[PDB]
């Protein structure tokens, strides 16, 4: 079954470009 | 000048709101 | 009702942009230092109110997610009660009983005592209040008393928002002169809204602007007027700032306009970058209750001579007096001294102004370089 | 100048992944309100980044 599949991609998405784009350490840094 | 800016507006409007 | 040119002038006012969110420097952190850039806040803000619903839903890893910001924000609180507590402690200390006053406004330069009414001025500071108290002067006061006639409160807050994120913008302000013979109240209220963030969407904004203004003993009636705005950015392009307003005003006696006059108009705004050139315009036609009044307003650059400004006015009346104004601007170093020079044209009247501002501030060259009015002043009896 | 007699200029093929296609074709986005509103944010998200 893979209906869950689209859901575990978003909350995985928005994360991962919490991480690499919008984080103002990083950006600090 | 009136009625093409009346246009422009009202396009620009339904434009904006469309999306 | 002021003239419908007063209402073109008011709508041609340029390129707008509303404004945004306001962001903690703590939570968004998560305790570490932060810089300063737009499209990394309002992402956070949105993200972590879908984070909150995404744990609510019953994901783990948003669940993770909203406790590790909760603890951040939790810390940041009690950090910044510490903090207030030690300067309270403080200034206890410093001070013992002794509240710290404040250095009276400065008028300036009268045959009365200088010194005179500092007294009345010098007040204990205020606590942490979210209002902001300003003084207004009028023109003329009277000879024997203070010219400080009336007062305006200003206030600014972000409601509706959970944990720093999120939110309505929203600023009133409210100036009141209230005395035993007239009254004038002058009220303005701004209200932000936002649709979508670059991550997931176009900038989408909507300002909601409402001012009255009331003077009861001399004009006896109030004016009301009201003004949405929509932008978004990259409507035609990458980006062109797209914006459309709309503006209703009412000059009613209370409440509707009951009969009273009314007036709407209608804005928009763009800037494209075609060439060399990066044109920006805004153009406005309002209509009173029946004349009809048009205006555009642009500014052009050339990127091979960044130094020259130039803007381009355009006003109509109802039909047909049409205005067109071009104004340049320029700039220069002399020797130990900077030149500005602003020249105005205008076709209607076929008249051009020419203005040179100068500022030298190594020695008195320009003033031995200009002597011709000591020639020209003669007594003539 | 001997392509001029025989030019055969073949091109522009996709390639699909069986795999990928099948697990994608087997899962029904639109016959659930759930799935449609996850589906959507995710779409969303994909076409804006
Ligand atoms: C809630 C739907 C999003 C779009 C709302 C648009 C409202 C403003 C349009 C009319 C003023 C020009």
Redesign the interface.
């Known amino acids: 079954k893979l209906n869950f599949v689209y859901?575990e991609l978003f909350?995985k998405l928005?994360?991962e470009?919490?991480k690499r784009?919008?984080?103002?350490?990083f950006?600090?840094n | 000048?009136?009625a093409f800016?009346?246009f422009?507006?009202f396009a620009?409007?339904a434009?904006?709101?469309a999306? | 009702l002021p003239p419908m040119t007063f209402f073109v002038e008011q709508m041609s006012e340029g390129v707008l942009k509303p404004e945004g969110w306001a962001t903690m420097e703590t939570v968004?952190?998560?305790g570490?230092?932060?810089?300063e850039?737009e499209?990394?806040?309002s992402?956070?803000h949105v993200?972590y109110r879908?984070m909150y619903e995404?744990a609510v839903a019953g994901?783990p890893?948003?669940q993770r997610?909203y406790a590790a910001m909760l603890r951040a924000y939790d810390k940041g609180c009690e950090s910044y009660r510490a903090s207030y507590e030690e300067a309270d402690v403080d200034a206890n200390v410093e001070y013992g009983v002794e509240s710290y006053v404040v250095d009276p406004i400065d008028f300036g330069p009268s045959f009365d005592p200088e010194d005179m009414y500092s007294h009345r001025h010098a007040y204990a500071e205020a606590a942490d209040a979210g209002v902001t108290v300003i003084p207004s002067q009028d023109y003329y006061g009277p000879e024997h008393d203070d010219p400080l006639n009336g007062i305006v409160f200003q206030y600014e807050a972000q409601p509706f928002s959970r944990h720093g994120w999120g939110g309505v913008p929203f600023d009133l302000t409210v100036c009141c002169e209230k005395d035993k013979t007239s009254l004038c109240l002058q009220g303005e209220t701004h209200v932000s809204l936002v649709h979508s963030v670059?991550?997931?969407?176009?900038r989408?904004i909507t300002q909601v602007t409402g001012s009255w203004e009331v003077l009861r003993p001399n004009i006896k009636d109030v004016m009301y007027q009201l003004e949405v705005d929509?932008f978004?950015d990259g409507?035609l392009g990458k980006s062109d700032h797209?914006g459309?307003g709309?503006m209703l005003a009412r000059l009613g006696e209370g409440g509707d306009p009951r009969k009273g006059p009314t007036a709407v108009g209608?804005?928009?705004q763009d800037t494209l970058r075609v060439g060399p050139f990066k044109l920006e315009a805004c153009?406005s036609?309002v209509a009173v209750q029946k004349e009809?009044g048009?205006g555009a307003r642009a500014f052009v650059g050339y990127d091979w001579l960044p130094g020259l400004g130039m803007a381009f006015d355009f006003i109509?009346e109802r039909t047909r007096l049409r205005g067109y104004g071009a104004n340049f601007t320029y700039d220069w170093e002399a020797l130990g001294a900077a030149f500005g020079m602003e020249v105005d044209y205008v076709a209607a009247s076929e008249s051009v102004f020419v203005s040179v501002n100068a500022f030298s501030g190594n020695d008195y060259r320009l003033g031995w370089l200009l002597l011709l009015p000591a020639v020209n002043y003669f007594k003539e009896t | 100048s001997k392509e001029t007699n025989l030019t055969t200029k073949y091109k522009s093929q996709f390639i699909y992944s069986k795999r990928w296609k099948s697990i994608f074709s087997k899962i029904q986005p639109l016959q659930n309100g759930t799935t449609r509103k996850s589906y959507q944010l995710f779409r969303?998200?994909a076409k804006?980044?």
Request: glycine share 8%; proline share 4%; net charge negative.
């Open positions: 859901s909350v928005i994360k470009c919490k784009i919008h984080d103002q350490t950006l600090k | 000048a009136a800016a009346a422009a507006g620009f409007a434009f904006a709101a999306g | 968004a952190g998560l570490e230092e932060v810089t850039d499209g990394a806040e992402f956070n993200y879908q995404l994901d890893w948003a997610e670059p991550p997931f969407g176009p989408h929509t978004k409507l797209a459309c709309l209608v804005r928009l153009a036609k009809e048009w109509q | 969303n998200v804006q980044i």
